[PDB]
Amino acid sequence: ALLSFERKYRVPGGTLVGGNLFDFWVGPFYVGFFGVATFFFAALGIILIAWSAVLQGTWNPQLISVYPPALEYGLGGAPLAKGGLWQIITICATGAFVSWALREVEICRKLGIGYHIPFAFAFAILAYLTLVLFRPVMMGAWGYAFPYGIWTHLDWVSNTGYTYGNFHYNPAHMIAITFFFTNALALALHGALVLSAANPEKGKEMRTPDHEDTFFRDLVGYSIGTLGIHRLGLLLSLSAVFFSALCMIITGTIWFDQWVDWWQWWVKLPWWANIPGGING
Amino acid sequence: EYQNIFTQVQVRGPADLGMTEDVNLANRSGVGPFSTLLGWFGNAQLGPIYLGSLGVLSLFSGLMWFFTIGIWFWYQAGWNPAVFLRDLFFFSLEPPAPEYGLSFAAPLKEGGLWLIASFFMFVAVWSWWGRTYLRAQALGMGKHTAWAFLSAIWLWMVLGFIRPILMGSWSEAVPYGIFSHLDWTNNFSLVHGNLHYNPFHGLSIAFLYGSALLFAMHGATILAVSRFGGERELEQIADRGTAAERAALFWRWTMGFNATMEGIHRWAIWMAVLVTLTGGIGILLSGTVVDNWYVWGQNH
Amino acid sequence: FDLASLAIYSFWIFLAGLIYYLQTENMREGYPLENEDGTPAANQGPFPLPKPKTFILPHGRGTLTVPGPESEDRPIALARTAVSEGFPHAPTGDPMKDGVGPASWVARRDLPELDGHGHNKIKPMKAAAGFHVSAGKNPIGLPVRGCDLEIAGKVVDIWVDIPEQMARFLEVELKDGSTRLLPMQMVKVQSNRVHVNALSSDLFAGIPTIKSPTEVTLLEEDKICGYVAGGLMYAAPKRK
Numbered sequence: 117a118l119l120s121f122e123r124k125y126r127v128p129g130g131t132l133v134g135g136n137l138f139d140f141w142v143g144p145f146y147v148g149f150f151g152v153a154t155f156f157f158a159a160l161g162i163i164l165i166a167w168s169a170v171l172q173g174t175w176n177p178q179l180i181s182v183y184p185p186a187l188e189y190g191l192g193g194a195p196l197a198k199g200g201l202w203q204i205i206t207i208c209a210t211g212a213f214v215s216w217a218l219r220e221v222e223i224c225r226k227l228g229i230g231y232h233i234p235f236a237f238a239f240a241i242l243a244y245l246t247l248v249l250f251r252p253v254m255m256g257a258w259g260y261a262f263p264y265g266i267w268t269h270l271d272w273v274s275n276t277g278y279t280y281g282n283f284h285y286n287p288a289h290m291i292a293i294t295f296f297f298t299n300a301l302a303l304a305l306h307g308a309l310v311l312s313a314a315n316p317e318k319g320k321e322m323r324t325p326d327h328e329d330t331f332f333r334d335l336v337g338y339s340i341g342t343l344g345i346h347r348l349g350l351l352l353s354l355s356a357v358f359f360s361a362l363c364m365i366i367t368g369t370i371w372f373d374q375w376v377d378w379w380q381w382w383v384k385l386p387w388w389a390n391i392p393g394g395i396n397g
Numbered sequence: 398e399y400q401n402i403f404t405q406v407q408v409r410g411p412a413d414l415g416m417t418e419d420v421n422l423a424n425r426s427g428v429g430p431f432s433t434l435l436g437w438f439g440n441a442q443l444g445p446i447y448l449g450s451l452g453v454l455s456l457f458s459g460l461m462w463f464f465t466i467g468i469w470f471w472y473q474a475g476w477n478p479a480v481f482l483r484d485l486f487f488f489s490l491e492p493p494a495p496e497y498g499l500s501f502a503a504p505l506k507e508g509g510l511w512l513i514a515s516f517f518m519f520v521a522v523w524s525w526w527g528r529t530y531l532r533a534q535a536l537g538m539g540k541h542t543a544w545a546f547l548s549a550i551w552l553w554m555v556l557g558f559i560r561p562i563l564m565g566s567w568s569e570a571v572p573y574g575i576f577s578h579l580d581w582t583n584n585f586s587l588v589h590g591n592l593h594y595n596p597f598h599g600l601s602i603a604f605l606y607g608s609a610l611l612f613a614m615h616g617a618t619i620l621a622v623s624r625f626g627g628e629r630e631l632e633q634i635a636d637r638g639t640a641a642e643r644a645a646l647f648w649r650w651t652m653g654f655n656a657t658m659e660g661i662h663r664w665a666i667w668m669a670v671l672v673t674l675t676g677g678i679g680i681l682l683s684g685t686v687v688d689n690w691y692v693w694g695q696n697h
Numbered sequence: 698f699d700l701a702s703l704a705i706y707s708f709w710i711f712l713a714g715l716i717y718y719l720q721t722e723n724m725r726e727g728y729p730l731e732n733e734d735g736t737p738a739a740n741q742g743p744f745p746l747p748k749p750k751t752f753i754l755p756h757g758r759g760t761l762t763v764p765g766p767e768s769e770d771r772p773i774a775l776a777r778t779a780v781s782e783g784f785p786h787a788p789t790g791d792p793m794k795d796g797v798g799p800a801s802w803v804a805r806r807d808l809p810e811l812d813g814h815g816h817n818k819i820k821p822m823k824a825a826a827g828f829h830v831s832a833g834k835n836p837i838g839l840p841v842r843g844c845d846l847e848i849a850g851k852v853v854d855i856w857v858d859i860p861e862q863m864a865r866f867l868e869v870e871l872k873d874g875s876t877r878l879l880p881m882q883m884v885k886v887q888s889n890r891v892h893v894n895a896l897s898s899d900l901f902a903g904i905p906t907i908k909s910p911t912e913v914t915l916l917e918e919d920k921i922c923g924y925v926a927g928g929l930m931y932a933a934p935k936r937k
């Protein structure tokens with residue numbers, strides 16, 4: 117079925133591979149070659165998860181966990197039950213994520229819009245590959261990657277973090293958190309501002325974008341603008357994910373001590389390092 | 398091709414003094430200077446700003462809070478400027494010890510000063526909340542901003558006021574310090590058996606992650622259709638254009654459903670306010686109802 | 698069954714109602730779903746249509762009630778390519794001129810968007826007292842070059858969003874004396890030229906014209922922008 121206004125956009129063209137062989141829809145979904153690829157990887161990877169559950173002896177989603185190979189395996193292949201399934205599933209997951217992005221690109225072309233959406237999605241992929249590929253390889257073992265399990269993958273975050281004391285002190289970790297908090301702060305304000313203009317007080321006409329600008333100048337003396345706030349939102353969420361991959365690619369590769377010790381260069385500068393008093397004196 | 402992340406050609410004109418409506422024009426400053434720097438990314442105009450009794454009260458009250466923490470850090474630094482900059486992030490203004498309970502009789506150097514600062518912060522934030530309400534009201538706008546702000550205030554109230562009271566001790570509040578408040582956050586989880594197993598903490602994370610997901614989707618979507626004037630979302634609500642249709646169709650073809658130009662902003666405001674809404678609940682239950690989240694979690 | 702369990706159960710119930718509410722709110726445009734022949738689709742989904750809300754538009758522009766009877770209010774020059782549903786509909790003529798596919802435009806009101814004071818939101822800079830170029834390269838005077846590396850005209854003015862103080866269109870003078878508007882988001886301002894990769898020099902004259910030299914309506918903006926964006930797909934043969 118179509119939206120009332122949708123038919124005029126359902127023209128042929130825009131594909132990158134296969135010409136018009138996969139240029140069609142299944143209900144609302146556009147297929148395309150990479151839609152077929154996406155389905156192939158996703159189905160294969162889900163079958164392996166189901167198989168890993170059998171080897172594990174449970175069909176409870178809260179308990180299923182596919183672990184990577186043991187550290188002793190280094191970067192080599194492992195038997196299916198001993199990490200091989202994690203390896204193949206990781207290949208399938210990567211395939212699905214990448215195919216999904218190239219599918220979005222084909223949809224951008226058919227609709228004549230910009231490629232901003234798949235470009236932003238590539239940052240989320242980069243963060244995933246940082247944790248399962250780039251960081252394990254640089255550390256020399258697939259076992260450093262995280263397990264595929266609802267709760268076990270949270271234990272991994274905790275074990276990994278506490279290996280370096282309080283991960284809060286990771287300075288890249290602070291920057292990423294600042295962007296995550298600021299992003300949610302900005303999303304709340306942006307959603308609230310449009311709704312407050314489009315849904316004014318009772319007995320009032322719809323507000324204009326000038327009212328939006330005036331409201332924020334009245335509030336904090338500056339309005340970024342209707343275009344700038346969407347630029348800002350894009351930048352805040354991507355920078356957050358960027359510094360996330362950054363704060364992890366350096367952990368265990370160029371930094372091995374507790375992250376609090378990274379702050380000693382400031383404290384122990386030979387000039388004020390010995391001045392008595394304060395916290396460190 | 399051009400990606401519309403930065404303006405190519407800035408244009409400048411007479412400053413925009415803004416809509417009037419029922420705003421008291423006596424409390425609006427003059428216009429500030431234009432910023433070519435900000436013009437590459439957004440608007441270059443700074444000011445004017447509205448400054449009523451609440452703004453003055455909030456600002457003054459907020460500076461007292463800032464000054465109170467300050468003189469304490471100078472006192473911990475022994476009044477030495479070098480030690481001040483050296484240990485700036487290590488200084489901390491802690492609440493009263495558990496022995497004082499909920500008493501305001503703690504001496505200044507054992508939580509008394511933390512209570513004074515907390516009072517100034519309390520007035521600054523709530524008077525600022527009334528500001529976000531009256532500013533929308535003076536312009537005849539809805540109060541969505543004030544209600545979204547309440548969600549952030551909710552968590553802030555739980556951390557330093559509501560939960561400590563329910564625990565019966567100001568010592569359960571958070572300290573004023575860069576590193577000290579990070580340490581507080583770490584100890585809070587360890588004491589309550591791992592917050593990863595607090596389901597309201599997990600929900601909070603889902604909405605935090607979901608806020609970055611949604612704003613990246615929405616920001617990228619609007620830029621992708623800015624070639625059709627898609628950022629003029631209010632007029633796209635009143636008179637749907639091709640920008641809104643292409644945006645909706647991209648997502649429908651991608652993930653099977655879509656939003657409207659107005660409806661996407663209800664997704665956004667709720668995705669964001671649920672971060673601190675569930676977070677405040679999770680913290681409020683820690684120690685009052687549940688002592689160990691991991692253990693509590695195994696029984697469910 | 699402690700208070701924590703009761704809370705997390707209550708929240709999941711609350712969240713399900715919120716999702717139901719959010720999804721219905723996002724069904725105020727484009728619904729009910731149609732078959733490819735225009736008739737209502739039998740399977741409309743598990744979410745019902747929302748009840749109408751009313752916006753009162755400023756400046757005496759009327760009221761909008763959504764949801765309401767939908768209509769394209771324009772011919773669509775497409776034809777089915779398959780008996781079954783889910784396949785492309787092929788253009789029957791010139792898609793750029795017929796405004797289909799990436800060249801689509803919506804039948805918006807033939808009126809200009811207004812600012813908070815009731816004045817035209819978008820204006821040519823020559824008619825915008827006080828406005829000027831404050832940073833970057835001034836494109837006025839520069840030659841405009843198409844994807845075929847031929848020159849189509851020269852920039853003669855900039856149409857600015859006055860409330861937002863932003864450039865939105867370049868007014869380009871064609872070889873024949875007339876002018877056209879080019880979306881600012883589809884041009885590349887370079888040191889010595891403006892490059893438009895979406896169109897070839899001989900497709901600029903096909904850009905829809907505006908009926909007033911000092912204002913542009915919402916309908917005209919959609920036709921202009923759709924035509925330019927449509928060039929990325931339908932003007933590809935002449936792209937060097």
Ligand code: BCL
Nearest residue numbers: 240241243244273274276277282283284292293360361364
């Ligand atoms: C005890 C634990 C430690 C700690 C240890 C760690 C460790 C260890 C790590 C982090 C990382 C992060 N931490 Mg920390 N961290 C702690 C405390 C905090 C606090 C806090 C208030 O205390 C905060 C706010 C944060 C914040 C954050 C972020 C900066 C970051 C997670 C986001 C990210 O990378 O996304 C990136 C996004 C993704 C990976 C998602 C990618 C999705 C892919 C592309 C697609 C999926 C498709 C899906 C399968 C399909 C489903 C289809 C169905 C139809 C639905 N940490 C404490 C001190 N933190 C992580 C990080 O930086 O990672 C890079 C990380 O590994």
Ligand code: BCL
Nearest residue numbers: 165244262266267269270273598599600602603606607610
């Ligand atoms: C980002 C840094 C850390 C990390 C740290 C944390 C922490 C800390 C928490 C989670 C939580 C979650 N994480 Mg994790 N997580 C990481 C990597 C991942 C990846 C991945 C492929 O990279 C995935 C798919 C997930 C998935 C999930 C969900 C089970 C859950 C809520 C996320 C959410 O809503 O996000 C925002 C996304 C949306 C709002 C969109 C909807 C996405 C849905 C929910 C995805 C469902 C995936 C499904 C369960 C698995 C695939 C099914 C296949 C058919 C097999 N995590 C890395 C290693 N994650 C939280 C939780 O409650 O865990 C139990 C939690 O507390």
Ligand code: BCL
Nearest residue numbers: 549550553582583585586592593598601602605676677679
């Ligand atoms: C050792 C660390 C513990 C842990 C302990 C805690 C604790 C303790 C808390 C959190 C909280 C949060 N944690 Mg945790 N957390 C851990 C691991 C993680 C991981 C991870 C990758 O593993 C992630 C992603 C998170 C993520 C999160 C967030 C979802 C949540 C904070 C919400 C928020 O927006 O706060 C930022 C927003 C605020 C603090 C609101 C403040 C609003 C006020 C009104 C603003 C005041 C303004 C003031 C005047 C400043 C003026 C400055 C001006 C610019 C002038 N945690 C581990 C297990 N986490 C909180 C929560 O809700 O938990 C459920 C919380 O209290």
Ligand SMILES: CC[C@H]1c2cc3[nH]c4c(c3C)C(=O)[C@H](C(=O)OC)c4c3nc(cc4[nH]c(cc(n2)[C@@H]1C)c(C(C)=O)c4C)[C@@H](C)[C@@H]3CCC(=O)OC/C=C(\C)CCC[C@H](C)CCC[C@H](C)CCCC(C)C
Nearest residue numbers: 158161208209212216236237239240264265266606609610
């Ligand atoms: C980069 C900024 C943020 C962002 C952006 C972003 N994400 C995106 C996009 C963008 C712009 C899309 O365009 C795309 C989309 O379509 O969204 C609706 C997407 C998307 N982001 C998603 C999820 C997601 N994004 C996240 C994060 C972020 N996304 C960042 C914070 C997170 C987390 C944890 O924070 C998650 C969970 C999806 C909903 C969607 C991509 C869907 C996709 O790729 O579909 C193809 C894949 C399948 C259909 C199934 C694959 C199955 C696998 C083969 C097996 C499972 C493997 C997996 C490793 C199991 C492990 C799970 C355990 C951890 C429990």
Ligand SMILES: COC1=C(OC)C(=O)C(C/C=C(\C)CC/C=C(\C)CC/C=C(\C)CC/C=C(\C)CC/C=C(\C)CC/C=C(\C)CCC=C(C)C)=C(C)C1=O
Nearest residue numbers: 145151155614615618644645648652655656657658661664
């Ligand atoms: C202003 O402009 C905007 C819009 O229009 C006006 C929008 O509409 C949206 C979209 C946003 C929403 C609708 C909000 C809700 C979404 C959220 C919270 C994200 C989270 C979403 C989910 C959890 C759902 C994700 C679902 C999927 C990825 C689909 C599952 C995948 C499937 C079924 C496989 C794909 C199918 C195929 C390839 C076809 C089958 C193939 C075969 C070979 C058989 C945005 C951002 C926007 O700015």
Ligand SMILES: COC(C)(C)C(=O)C/C=C(\C)CC/C=C(\C)CC/C=C(\C)CCCC/C(C)=C/CC[C@H](C)CC/C=C(\C)CCC=C(C)C
Nearest residue numbers: 463466467468515516519553554557558571573574575578
């Ligand atoms: C030269 O420098 C000078 C001295 C001028 C300075 O000014 C330097 C100053 C600084 C560098 C200040 C630096 C500031 C910080 C490090 C602050 C850091 C703050 C945080 C990390 C956040 C902590 C906030 C959390 C808490 C505990 C909030 C309390 C809020 C409560 C809801 C209020 C509680 C109210 C109480 C107890 C009673 C008051 C009265 C009522 C009726 C409620």
Ligand SMILES: CCCCCCCC/C=C\CCCCCCCC(=O)OC[C@H](O)CO
Nearest residue numbers: 305306309328329336338339340341342345
């Ligand atoms: C002059 C001093 C500089 C400013 C003072 C610092 C306070 C702002 C900090 C964080 C929030 C970020 C602001 C972005 C939120 C804007 C919401 C929005 O939608 O604005 C669009 C536009 O303004 C409507 O026309």
Ligand SMILES: CCCCCCCCCCCC[N+](C)(C)[O-]
Nearest residue numbers: 191192193203206207210211249
């Ligand atoms: C489709 C692109 C795949 C490249 C990225 C895949 C990363 C996962 C690596 C797993 C290692 C598996 N193996 C067999 C090489 O040992």
Ligand SMILES: CCCCCCCCCCCC[N+](C)(C)[O-]
Nearest residue numbers: 214217218231234235238241398
């Ligand atoms: C590693 C993930 C791979 C998929 C990323 C998709 C990126 C799309 C960007 C297309 C670039 C088009 N261009 C030049 C007009 O910006």
Ligand SMILES: CCCCCCCCCCCC[N+](C)(C)[O-]
Nearest residue numbers: 539540541544545547548666670
């Ligand atoms: C604490 C959560 C607050 C909910 C956030 C969403 C607000 C929706 C209510 C709209 C306000 C209506 N009105 C008439 C006051 O403008």
Ligand SMILES: CCCCCCCCCCCC[N+](C)(C)[O-]
Nearest residue numbers: 595596597599600603607667668
């Ligand atoms: C308004 C958008 C709603 C998004 C809902 C996302 C649900 C994520 C589920 C996280 C799992 C939470 N829990 C209780 C198992 O810890």
Ligand SMILES: CCCCCCCCCCCC[N+](C)(C)[O-]
Nearest residue numbers: 117142143144145652653654742
């Ligand atoms: C809980 C997240 C998973 C659900 C995501 C949405 C499912 C697909 C959307 C429905 C469109 C397909 N349909 C129903 C018309 O056949």
Ligand SMILES: CCCCCCCCCCCC[N+](C)(C)[O-]
Nearest residue numbers: 674678700703704705707708711
């Ligand atoms: C025993 C009940 C404990 C609270 C359970 C949570 C359900 C209510 C959550 C939504 C709060 C209402 N609000 C303000 C968002 O509209």
Ligand SMILES: CCCCCCCCCCCC[N+](C)(C)[O-]
Nearest residue numbers: 710711712713714715717718719
């Ligand atoms: C099916 C049970 C659902 C119970 C909870 C329903 C929550 C409704 C959400 C309200 C949405 C915003 N509203 C209507 C207050 O403006």
Ligand SMILES: CCCCCCCCCCCC[N+](C)(C)[O-]
Nearest residue numbers: 144653654716720741742743744
């Ligand atoms: C947090 C996940 C969001 C769940 C979204 C579920 C609603 C999807 C609606 C599908 C039906 C829409 N349709 C096909 C009738 O247009």
Ligand SMILES: [Cl-]
Nearest residue numbers: 448449451452
């Ligand atoms: Cl005020």
